[model samples]
Target: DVLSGKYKGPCYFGIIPCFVRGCKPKLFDAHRKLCIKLCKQEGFKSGHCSNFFKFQCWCTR
Candidate 1:
């Protein structure tokens, strides 16, 4: 399961290059927050970080 699987609203996600391709704490924290901020400007109200197909930063309203 993933964050997108749980959220019912329209959602968006961003992918950033992560050499580990796993949940690296610092990388996810920085990039997820950055993506959340950008997604908010595009109308998303909530976001979270997860490792799925990539380093995913998910945003939803």
Candidate 2:
């Protein structure tokens, strides 16, 4: 997406629980916002979920 700019690899903005129900919660709007929030909190311009297997937070400059 425009906000993320590019895939800068999997960033570890923070930790999150693993999903066992075969669902990528971080891809959801509410959960995605959480990743963005955490990314900005660490001083990034913006961020997003890089994968569905886990909560991998990717940020932009």
Candidate 3:
């Protein structure tokens, strides 16, 4: 973080794909769905899928 701050309590750190190598579409969709769902709850999502070699979607709040 640019602020370089420490955090406490509950929050979404990073919702990332578990698989480096892309596999079943169901899993991919599942993770993405869950990621966004939680992000919506926290409403402080940051960044996109940066994994170039595999399918990934994530956020932070």
Candidate 4:
């Protein structure tokens, strides 16, 4: 999934647990916003979640 500049690769994976558990409200929202903004900057109209364990970010071509 798309992520903030400070969080990439495996650290991106760490974000999922926080999101799924519905904890860390503000931090989670901030990260999600950053990810969405980054994805849109790359031209993504929408993003998809494959499962509780998987989130993938895609940009429209």
Top-scoring candidate (TM-score) = 1
Give the number of the best model, judged by lDDT.
Answer: 1
Deviation in angstroms for 6 in model 2? 20
| Runs off by more than 4 Å, candidate 4 | 1-25, 29-35, 51-61
Q: Model 2 Cα displacement at 4 (Å)?
A: 12
lDDT of candidate 3?
0.38
The full ranking of all candidates by TM-score, starting with the best, is 1, 2, 4, 3
What are the per-residue Cα lDDT tens digits for candidate 2 across 3-61? 34332234444234553232454333334555455446445666656565543555566
Q: What are the models' TM-scores?
A: 0.43, 0.37, 0.28, 0.30
lDDT of 4 at 41: 53
| Model 4 pairs whose backbones collide | none
- Expressed as tens digits, the lDDT of each residue in 1-61 for candidate 1 is 2243222222244244543344464343345555455556544667666645644556667
TM-score between candidate 3 and the true structure: 0.28
Error of 3 at 14 (Å): 18
| Candidate 4 or 3, higher TM-score | 4
lDDT tens digits by residue: candidate 4, 1-61: 3433232222143344443344564344333343444456545554332334443333233
Q: Name the regions of candidate 2 deviating beyond 4 angstroms.
A: 1-29
Q: After TM-score superposition, what is the CA distance of residue 33 in candidate 4 from its true location, in Å?
A: 4.8
Where is model 3 more than 4 Å wrong at Cα? 1-29, 44-56
Evaluate model 1: give its lDDT: 0.47
